[PDB]
Amino acid sequence: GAMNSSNYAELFNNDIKLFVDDTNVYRVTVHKTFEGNVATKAINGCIFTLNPKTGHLFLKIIHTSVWAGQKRLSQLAKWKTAEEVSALVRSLPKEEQPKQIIVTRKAMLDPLEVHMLDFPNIAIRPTELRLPFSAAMSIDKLSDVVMKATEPQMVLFNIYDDWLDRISSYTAFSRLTLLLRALKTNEESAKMILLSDPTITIKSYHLWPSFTDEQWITIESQMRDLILTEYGRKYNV
Amino acid sequence: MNTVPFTSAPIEVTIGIDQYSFNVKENQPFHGIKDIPIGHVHVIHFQHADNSSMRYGYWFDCRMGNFYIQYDPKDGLYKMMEERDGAKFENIVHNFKERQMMVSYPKIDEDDTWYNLTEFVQMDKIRKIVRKDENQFSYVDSSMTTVQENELSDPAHSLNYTVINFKSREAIRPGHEMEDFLDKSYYLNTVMLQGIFKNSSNYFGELQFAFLNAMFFGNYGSSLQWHAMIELICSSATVPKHMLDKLDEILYYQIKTLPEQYSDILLNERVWNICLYSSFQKNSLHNTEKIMENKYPELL
Numbered sequence: 175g176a177m178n179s180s181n182y183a184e185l186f187n188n189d190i191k192l193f194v195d196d197t198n199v200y201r202v203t204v205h206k207t208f209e210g211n212v213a214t215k216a217i218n219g220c221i222f223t224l225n226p227k228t229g230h231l232f233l234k235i236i237h238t239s240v241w242a243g244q245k246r247l248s249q250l251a252k253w254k255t256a257e258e259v260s261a262l263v264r265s266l267p268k269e270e271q272p273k274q275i276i277v278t279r280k281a282m283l284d285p286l287e288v289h290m291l292d293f294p295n296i297a298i299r300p301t302e303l304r305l306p307f308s309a310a311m312s313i314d315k316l317s318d319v320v321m322k323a324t325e326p327q328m329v330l331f332n333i334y335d336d337w338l339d340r341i342s343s344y345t346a347f348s349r350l351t352l353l354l355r356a357l358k359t360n361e362e363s364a365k366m367i368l369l370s371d372p373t374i375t376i377k378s379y380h381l382w383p384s385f386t387d388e389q390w391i392t393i394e395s396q397m398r399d400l401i402l403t404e405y406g407r408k409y410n411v
Numbered sequence: 412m413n414t415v416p417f418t419s420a421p422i423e424v425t426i427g428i429d430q431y432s433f434n435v436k437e438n439q440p441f442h443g444i445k446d447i448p449i450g451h452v453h454v455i456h457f458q459h460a461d462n463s464s465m466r467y468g469y470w471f472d473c474r475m476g477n478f479y480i481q482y483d484p485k486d487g488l489y490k491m492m493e494e495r496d497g498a499k500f501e502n503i504v505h506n507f508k509e510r511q512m513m514v515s516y517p518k519i520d521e522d523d524t525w526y527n528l529t530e531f532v533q534m535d536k537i538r539k540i541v542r543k544d545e546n547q548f549s550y551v552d553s554s555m556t557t558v559q560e561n562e563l564s565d566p567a568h569s570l571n572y573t574v575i576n577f578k579s580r581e582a583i584r585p586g587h588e589m590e591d592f593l594d595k596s597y598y599l600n601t602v603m604l605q606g607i608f609k610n611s612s613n614y615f616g617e618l619q620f621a622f623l624n625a626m627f628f629g630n631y632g633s634s635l636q637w638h639a640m641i642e643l644i645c646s647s648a649t650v651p652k653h654m655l656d657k658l659d660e661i662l663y664y665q666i667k668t669l670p671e672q673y674s675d676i677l678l679n680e681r682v683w684n685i686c687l688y689s690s691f692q693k694n695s696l697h698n699t700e701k702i703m704e705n706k707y708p709e710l711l
């Protein structure tokens with residue numbers, strides 16, 4: 175059934191599973207027209223499909239041409255997400271196909287179930303976790319590839335860089351969610367924390383800086399401070 | 412007019428015949444029902460006074476044979492049987508009529524209710540939903556499950572309604588996932604009407620039979636089927652006009668006939684609100700919408 179705090183360790187067991195987040199598939203800017211009406215302009219988006227055990231990210235870039243001449247785009251976006259996730263599953267060798275797909279938004283359940291009817295043994299599940307995957311576009315290298323795309327494109331990444339050489343999947347996922355929650359809550363301050371030391375760089379083959387174990391402890395504490403600081407600012411606490 | 416005699420009434424029982432009902436006392440000199448209108452299917456049904464568990468009954472058509480009811484004290488129920496000896500049957504009925512031991516089917520001349528509820532219901536189709544080929548009549552009860560319920564456990568005692576499942580490969584063409592899920596017209600017109608039912612009359616006949624089994628027996632799986640067959644039409648953008656207008660008539664008489672106090676158990680809020688107010692056909696069921704709003708405004 176639904177994935178929550180009780181069954182959290184399940185995310186890191188040996189059954190292949192993927193999170194699917196559709197929050198960045200259909201992205202628009204809203205603006206006034208010459209006549210003083212309001213219009214939207216779409217920008218490139220992406221499907222965020224992540225294996226929480228291994229860190230493998232299947233970033234399907236959704237180019238604005240896929241919306242051309244289409245109506246009810248917010249509805250279409252859910253079905254396009256499901257079509258693309260289904261296509262990804264079919265493209266994977268049998269032994270790499272997931273046994274479960276966990277959608278971050280319950281409105282994805284029916285579109286994905288319908289697209290996956292040929293895979294009756296792949297469980298489609300919602301989650302009660304509030305995951306910050308909408309902030310994936312705050313990771314500079316992910317935003318850049320999405321914005322530069324001139325056509326539909328599938329880009330593969332490891333969202334954990336090389337962290338699994340030193341930490342478990344459980345800890346890597348916790349670090350990722352802390353970083354993304356901080357970037358979602360105060361992007362400017364979070365990016366300042368991550369780059370406030372010029373001597374620590376992001377490898378050409380990495381998304382995040384090359385912090386030592388001790389530096390990651392400091393960074394994680396600074397991210398928690400940022401989140402708590404923003405909570406106090408928001409609620410006047 | 413035809414007659415279903417009863418050998419006797421050894422246990423106290425509420426007897427239904429179509430939409431009518433009457434009470435019979437233990438060992439009362441009751442010997443059947445006469446003046447049954449020829450031309451329609453009928454249902455004779457039972458609920459025991461000492462055990463309201465198991466409503467049960469029999470669908471039959473007096474044009475197909477001579478039927479009577481006799482209580483079986485071993486199996487503990489009123490059973491329908493066929494009498495193959497015509498002269499014997501006529502002699503039995505005539506004596507019971509002469510002694511006035513029979514109730515008369517109480518049809519008012521102005522009253523088309525039973526026709527309206529059974530317009531498309533045929534005995535031959537009933538006998539394919541309820542499979543017991545050695546009898547010309549069909550037993551249904553409150554507890555019988557449907558083929559679809561069983562899939563989700565005695566197959567010989569199932570209700571073989573046509574399986575409708577909106578999230579199934581049968582309902583969704585590969586490559587038309589969004590289209591077919593949001594507009595069920597393919598599934599209704601190509602799969603169901605052209606493919607399985609062959610025509611709208613057979614579809615409506617099953618829909619009507621499901622409703623009647625839900626109402627007369629409280630058969631839950633039948634209620635599920637009735638609602639599924641309504642929702643399939645209402646969720647289709649492209650439905651022949653004659654079907655929409657006939658559906659409105661069908662549903663109007665079903666809602667009219669439903670006991671006011673059984674609405675909480677026989678009507679699905681989601682389906683009715685979707686069909687009447689959100690669906691493609693929300694403006695195509697004027698008579699049903701008006702009776703539903705005036706009779707069951709709480710459900711909505």
Ligand SMILES: CCCC(=O)N1CCN(CC(=O)O)CC1
Binds near residue numbers: 330332380
């Ligand atoms: C961490 C920055 C490295 C980068 O730009 N990508 C490009 C796409 N990916 C190769 C692939 O799509 O299979 C490697 C990761």
